């Protein structure tokens, strides 16, 4: 069995819809739902946790004073189930704030470290869903990268654009986020790491097996 954290940006900017089209939030939710549906249908043994960042509430083991705010553990590590599908589909909504992505990653790693203690997992994995529109502190990257490698946690990113034609009007913050994603994934697995960054559209096409 594996352990997977779905680390989903639900911050305010995720709710923006281009001309009524689907917002990044709805696109990310659809990818998460297709993944969870396949896991449940197959009776997979993998355990799935869900961390949301950008929530109006704060609920996580690291939260103190003004640290790790607006990050919430929606589902601790366990088998996915029909309750989770209903919650992701019909309960989870966008927040009205932004949270720091790297703090959400730290919360996700800490959750995996704590909740896999004394258990046997083949792999530990974190999947990030975001549009990279909000700021983060680049200095804490060194510790995060080191801890990911020590813990043998692998990463995937799911975005509304490629990390490599017509430009998409990306903000300077989104471009900085792109550089951060490339830095993390390259440190973790070189050039192959960069191929673990996907668009929502590509992921939906791969995962849309129920029709």
């Amino acid at each position: 069995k594996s352990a997977v954290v779905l680390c989903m940006d639900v911050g305010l900017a995720m709710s923006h819809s281009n001309q009524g089209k689907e917002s990044p939030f709805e696109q990310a939710k659809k990818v998460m739902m297709l993944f969870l549906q396949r896991q449940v249908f197959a009776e997979s043994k993998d355990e799935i946790a869900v961390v949301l960042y950008g929530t109006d509430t704060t609920d996580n083991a690291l939260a103190r004073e003004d640290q790790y705010e607006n990050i919430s553990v929606h589902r601790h590590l366990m088998l996915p189930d029909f309750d989770l599908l209903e919650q992701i589909e019909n309960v989870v909504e966008p927040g009205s704030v932004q949270a720091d992505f790297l703090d959400a990653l730290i919360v996700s790693m800490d959750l995996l470290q704590k909740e896999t203690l004394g258990k046997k997992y083949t792999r530990l994995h974190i999947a990030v869903f975001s549009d990279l529109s909000s700021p983060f502190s680049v200095d804490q990257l060194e510790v995060i990268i080191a801890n990911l490698k020590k813990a043998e946690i692998t990463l995937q990113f799911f975005l509304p654009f490629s990390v490599d034609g017509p430009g998409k009007g990306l903000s300077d913050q989104q471009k900085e986020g792109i550089e951060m994603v490339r830095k993390i994934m390259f440190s973790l697995d070189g050039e192959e790491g960069l191929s673990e960054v996907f668009t929502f559209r590509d992921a939906l096409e791969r995962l849309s097996i129920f029709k």
Partner: peptide, 5 residues
Amino acid sequence: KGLFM
């Protein structure tokens, strides 16, 4: 890999 595992 990952979610496509």
